Design a protein around this ligand. Structure first.
Ligand SMILES: O=C(O)CCC(=O)C(=O)O
Ligand SMILES: O=C(O)CCC(=O)C(=O)O
Ligand SMILES: [Fe+3]
Ligand SMILES: [Fe+3]
Ligand SMILES: [Fe+3]
Ligand SMILES: [Fe+3]
Lengths: 286, 15, 286, 15
């Protein structure tokens, strides 16, 4: 991955497809991990997205991949980043119920809509979809158009959302194009791109994907990803091991206090070692 | 809908 | 309310009860508002807490009351505050099913437990419970002990939580005391206080309360309150009106960009006026 | 339990 090249494509076209983002054992392990949640149906509750953190670090580590961080840093012009959201989801074929197309929309907004988005600099949002099955035109491909400003459409429509009806925005639907991709490919896109998910045309099978999005902390009304966990929880061990494996630049996206932060004292270094035995505290020592 | 938090007008939503 | 006096009681004892925080029409309107959600049962789904924002600003405005902000600013030593959570809840009597006591616990932790809490300065958390019914010993009073450090108990127990079992911490249960309060009283407490909810002993009726908690933005791994809303939503009008009514110091707790923030430009001032017609933009003009 | 988000070991939890 060439961070500057990918960030330039995001800026100009709104999206970039990275083939072979995962290969080898990393791909095999990620596929196995997501299949623990969404097994080969060969289901109602299994249509729901499952939020981070997952039961396997073969999924948890990917939204924080150093290559992804590098792209986002180049596009936004800041290193002060946060993971906004991450989840896994399966989209099932027609044998498992009616599958519908989403409306074209942007994802430029924070969840609360507290203030209107900006599509420039540190206010941009970057989305990723890591496909863990081969995606064809009959397995619910993502559709993309272009950045909203390039298309001359507003981020807030007259209907009061970031979605574009077919009756009001016909040209968007004529220009949309599907993204087909091999398993292990990563689609990156900016939140202000006009895009949608699509219906899974095929009868059997399901599309498997890991989703995430990242924002700059300067957009302070935006929430980072919310989850609840305590050391007593059965899933804590996996998360604890994730924190030990991550480098400081990656933990930063979870809101971890950075080197030099006032949080760090002899007592909090001690408590960090207690909660995450084996963690490297040297970057944080006062 | 098909998420885990808030509501999309049907059930819990992606956030 | 005397902010410095209340903050001193919070620092020394861990809690302070403010009688008559709401009086007059403000109290009557808040009671009516919460009763739209939890009517006089004279219910299963009605036992669930409902998160902010509410359908009435007679509830939404209270976690942001200037008097509450002043207390928290004095205790934490910073004005860079965020609302962590707010919700309303009814606790029903025994006629509506078995009511149980919570274990004593602290609420010193962020939801993700990402790093261990600090109970000093800007890392303190402040909780409020605004009681909207009269609370007696038979209507599920809050129980309090004292700050964890004062009691010599850890914020992380050997069980891996912030909760204190009766078998491991018997002295805490012998020292706990109920808080009785008239409707319109506000209980404030620090997150590191050992406390619990209790069973509603009475057969009929329910306790009504509005809950909120606030933290300092320096504790950057902590999440501010998460909600989803867009201008199309039926509840947007109420929230829009709330934003117009609030002063800058209050909007700050929602993550609103402060005066002088790089977010503010001619274009974003325009978009702010469009989304919140009538809002005073003068504090934010570049 | 008795909340709106995540899980307390029974159903959705207060957060
Ligand atoms: O599932 C998809 O292909 C697209 C979903 C979408 O709109 C997004 O990831 O923001
Ligand atoms: O409901 C209550 O009285 C107390 C609940 C509690 O533990 C809290 O508000 O943190
Ligand atoms: Fe452009
Ligand atoms: Fe989208
Ligand atoms: Fe003390
Ligand atoms: Fe509590």
């Amino acid at each position: 991955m060439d961070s500057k090249s990918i960030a330039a494509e995001l800026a100009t076209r709104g999206y970039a497809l990275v083939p072979d983002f995962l290969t080898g054992d990393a791909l095999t392990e990620a596929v196995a991990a997501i299949e623990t949640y969404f097994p080969d149906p060969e289901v109602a509750a299994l249509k729901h997205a499952v939020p981070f953190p997952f039961t396997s670090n073969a999924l948890n580590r990917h939204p924080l991949d150093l290559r992804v961080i590098s792209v986002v840093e180049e596009l936004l012009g800041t290193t002060d980043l946060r993971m906004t959201s991450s989840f896994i989801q399966a989209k099932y074929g027609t044998a498992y119920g009616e599958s519908k197309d989403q409306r074209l929309h942007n994802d430029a907004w924070a969840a609360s809509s507290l203030v209107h988005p900006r599509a420039d600099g540190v206010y941009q949002r970057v989305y990723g979809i890591l496909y863990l099955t081969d995606v064809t035109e009959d397995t619910a491909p993502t559709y993309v158009v272009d950045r909203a400003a390039h298309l001359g459409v507003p981020l807030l429509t007259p209907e009061g959302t970031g979605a574009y009806s077919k009756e009001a925005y016909p040209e968007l639907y004529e220009r949309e194009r599907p993204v087909v991709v091999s398993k292990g490919s990563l689609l990156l896109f900016v939140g202000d791109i006009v895009h949608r998910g699509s219906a899974y045309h095929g009868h059997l099978g399901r599309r498997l994907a890991l989703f995430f999005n990242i924002h700059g902390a300067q957009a302070r009304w935006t929430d980072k990803h919310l989850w609840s966990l305590r050391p007593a929880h059965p899933d804590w061990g996996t998360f604890r091991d994730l924190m030990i494996e991550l480098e400081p630049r990656q933990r930063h996206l979870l809101g971890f206090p950075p080197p030099g932060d006032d949080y760090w004292t002899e007592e909090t270094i001690k408590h960090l070692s207690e909660m995450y035995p084996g963690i490297d505290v040297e970057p944080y020592l006062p | 809908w098909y998420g885990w938090a808030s509501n999309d007008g049907e059930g819990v939503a992606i956030i």
